[PDB]
Amino acid sequence: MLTKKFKETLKYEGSVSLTSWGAEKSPHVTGTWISYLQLTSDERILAPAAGMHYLEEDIKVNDTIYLMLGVREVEGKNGYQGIGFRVSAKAKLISNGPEFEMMKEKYPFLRAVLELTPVEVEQLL
């Protein structure tokens, strides 16, 4: 599901966009940092949730989000310097357990872990 190139991107830094929708007429966009993402052995993507109020209300209605990220330092299609990804994922927020404990240690500011289950990965460059 998560290619070698996707995994390579996660070694750099950049803005991650999280698009959610369903609780209001318009969608919401929430950010995180590539360096805050943690890959699990079953290739779930975890991020520290500090605020993410709107995204939480959206995913109570529609648990599908879009993640977008891109870095200049990874070679895209046709040697193009730069790569981007659009990931469709199912979202839930985790408030306890060993992964929460592991993330709470790295990111003391978090109230919950955002757990993303990738359902589709599109490499865009």
Ligand X SMILES: Cc1cc2nc3c(=O)[nH]c(=O)nc-3n(C[C@H](O)[C@H](O)[C@H](O)COP(=O)(O)O)c2cc1C
Site membership for ligand X, residue 9 (CB under 6 A):
no
User: Is 54 annotated as contributing to ligand binding?
Assistant: yes
Residue reference for tokens 């830094």: 13
Site membership for a second copy, residue 71 (CB under 8 A):
yes
Site membership for a second copy, residue 119 (CB under 8 A):
no
Exposed e or buried b per residue across 42-58, where buried means at least 16 C-beta atoms within 10 angstroms of its C-beta: eebbbbbbeebebbbeb
CA 3/CA 102 separation, integer angstroms = 24
Site membership for a second copy, residue 17 (CB under 8 A):
yes
Residue 52 interacts with, from ligand X, a second copy, none (CB under 5-8 Å by kind): ligand X
Kindly state the smallest distance separating residue 41's Cβ from ligand X, in Å.
Answer: 22
- Binding residues for ligand X (CB under 6 A): 15, 30-33, 36, 47-55, 68, 70, 84, 124-125
